[PDB]
């Protein structure tokens, strides 16, 4: 039980990592309001760790628990909604967000994904940022706001990509890669000490 | 009986006292409270008052028969943002300010919205919440500007924003006054039992 990750909607970590084994737990986490996405996610990961601690596996050795969170920061909303994108997406949907942005002076934005890992004592966070533009929906529409996000100077949306091109621009991948190197440096450190 | 409104805002304190008109003795306590993320503002405020109650109760080393703790929370619900930001208004306000929100709303098909004030009271066993709701329009800032987004909320059919209006003009109109008179009736009812 050395590495625990939490979601029910997500099979990205599967394909993103192969050098380590990982477990997937589903907990119903209460998020808090704050200004910094990292603050929200570190609180969430500590909260989840504690729930995993008091329930069942209360007796064991070092355990790593991981949560993620994504924000969408829209330039002409002065970087709103950030970590509240999921309430905006619930209210407006991809089409509604794109129609709002088509009424602003420009459509530039950026998406941030953060991983946070907690071992009972230490918290670590890794964020990936990808600049882009809100555009009218294109591509798959079951992946949230992927269909309206057009990264960098490209002509596609995330909803129009699969995994070859998406990964390289995915803020989640940029973040994950930092998280993997930390986990592997902890696993390597563990093994040298035996 | 013992009633506590949670606030550190001196202006909010005096407005409450004046609403109460010496009908009930109300004490104030300045406690920072975390706001969870949730769909409904009442769910947010109810969690917040239950938290405020427990912080006060553990501190006091007391247990009273009846002790009433009250928190409030407000939201701005913009019609052409499909009622977003709602309870997240203050993160929009911090990002964009009053001028920025008015500017954004003026780019949508209309500037209609509604504002909601909520009071939640908790005695340790039962939680009760009260929702005051008022329709309006988002306009260029007008009046006092140190009261959050009052200066851009123009209650429906009127030509003044809340920032230009007096206490008497808000009676039966301000979402806070509507919620307060419900709360006060509940507290008065609880007082007959004492």
Cα first-last separation, chain B: 6
Using CA coordinates, name the residue in chain A closest to B93: A80
Let me know: does A138 contact A147? Beta carbons within 8 Å.
yes
**Residues of A in Cβ contact (< 8 Å) with B104:** 76-77, 104
| DSSP code, position B110 | -
| DSSP code, position B150 | G
Let me know: does B127 contact B120? Beta carbons within 8 Å.
yes
Other CB atoms closer than 10 Å to residue B193's CB: what's the count?
A: 7
A166 is in an annotated binding site: yes
Top residue of A28, A29, A32, A33 to mutate, by most chain B CBs within 10 Å, is A33
Instruction: Say yes or no: B85 contacts chain A, CB-CB below 8 A.
Output: yes
Residues in chain A whose C lies over 2.5 Å from the next residue's N (breaks after): none
Tokens (6 digits) for A103: 């009424």
Let me know: does B29 contact B54? Beta carbons within 8 Å.
no
> Minimal CA–CA distance to B69: which of B129, B132, B133?
B129
| DSSP code, position A26 | -
Using CA atoms, how far residue B138 sits from B50, B65, B109, B191, in Å, is 33, 45, 12, 39
Instruction: Say yes or no: A16 contacts chain B, CB-CB below 8 A.
Output: no
> Hey, is B164 helix, strand or coil?
coil
**Residues of B in Cβ contact (< 8 Å) with A72:** none
A171 is in an annotated binding site: yes
The answer to whether the CB atoms of A84 and B86 lie below 8 A apart is no
Let me know: does B48 contact B71? Beta carbons within 8 Å.
yes
Write the burial class of residue B30 (CB in 10 Å: 0-12 exposed, 13-18 middle, 19+ buried).
Answer: exposed
Instruction: Say yes or no: A80 contacts chain B, CB-CB below 8 A.
Output: yes
**Residues of B in Cβ contact (< 8 Å) with A47:** none
Using CA coordinates, name the residue in chain A closest to B36: A32
Other CB atoms closer than 10 Å to residue B185's CB: what's the count?
A: 11
Instruction: Say yes or no: A91 contacts chain B, CB-CB below 8 A.
Output: yes
Using CA coordinates, name the residue in chain B closest to A102: B107
For this PDB entry, the determination method is X-ray
> Minimal CA–CA distance to B55: which of B9, B126, B15, B4?
B4
Q: Of B36, B84, B108, which is closest to A87 when you measure between CB atoms? A: B84
| Segment 23-62 of chain A within 8 Å of chain B by CB | 30-33, 35, 40
The partner residues of A6 in beta bridges, in order of sequence, read A25
Let me know: does B15 contact B167? Beta carbons within 8 Å.
yes
| Entry field: residues in chain A | 194
Instruction: Say yes or no: A106 contacts chain B, CB-CB below 8 A.
Output: no
Residue with tokens 């993320």: B37
The domains of chain A, with CATH numbers, are 3-178 (3.90.950.10)
Resolution value, angstrom units: 2.4
Most distant CA pair in chain A: distance in Å?
Answer: 60
Using CA atoms, how far residue B190 sits from A111, B119, B120, in Å, is 50, 16, 15
> Hey, is A123 helix, strand or coil?
strand
Instruction: Say yes or no: A103 contacts chain B, CB-CB below 8 A.
Output: yes
> Hey, is A32 helix, strand or coil?
strand
The answer to whether the CB atoms of A96 and B108 lie below 8 A apart is no
**Residues of A in Cβ contact (< 8 Å) with B110:** none
A30 is in an annotated binding site: no
**Residues of B in Cβ contact (< 8 Å) with A77:** 92, 95-96, 104
What is the spatial distance between Cα B120 and Cα B145, in angstroms, rounded to a whole number?
27
Q: Say whether the peptide bond before residue B85 is cis (omega within 30 degrees of 0).
A: yes
Q: B175-193 and B10-20 helices cross at what angle (nearest 10)?
A: 60
């Amino acid at each position: 039980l050395v590495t625990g990750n939490m979601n029910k909607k997500e099979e990205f970590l599967k394909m993103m990592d192969e050098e380590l084994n990982v477990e997937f737990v589903n907990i119903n986490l209460e998020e808090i309001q704050a200004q910094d996405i990292v603050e929200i996610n570190e609180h969430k990961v500590k909260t989840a760790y504690n729930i995993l601690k008091k329930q069942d596996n209360n007796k064991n050795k070092k355990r790593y628990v991981i949560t993620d969170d994504t924000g969408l920061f829209i330039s002409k909303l002065n970087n709103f909604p950030g970590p509240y994108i999921k309430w905006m997406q619930k209210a407006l949907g991809s089409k509604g967000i794109a129609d709002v942005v088509s009424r602003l002076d420009d459509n530039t934005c950026h998406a941030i994904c953060t991983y946070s890992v907690y071992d009972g004592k230490d918290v670590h966070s890794f964020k990936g940022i990808t600049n882009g533009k809100i555009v009218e929906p294109r591509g798959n529409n079951k992946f949230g706001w992927d269909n309206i996000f057009q990264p960098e100077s490209l002509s596609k949306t995330f909803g129009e990509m699969t995994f070859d091109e998406k990964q390289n621009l995915s803020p989640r991948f940029k973040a994950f890669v930092q998280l993997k190197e930390f986990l592997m440096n902890e696993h390597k450190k563990y093994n040298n000490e035996f």
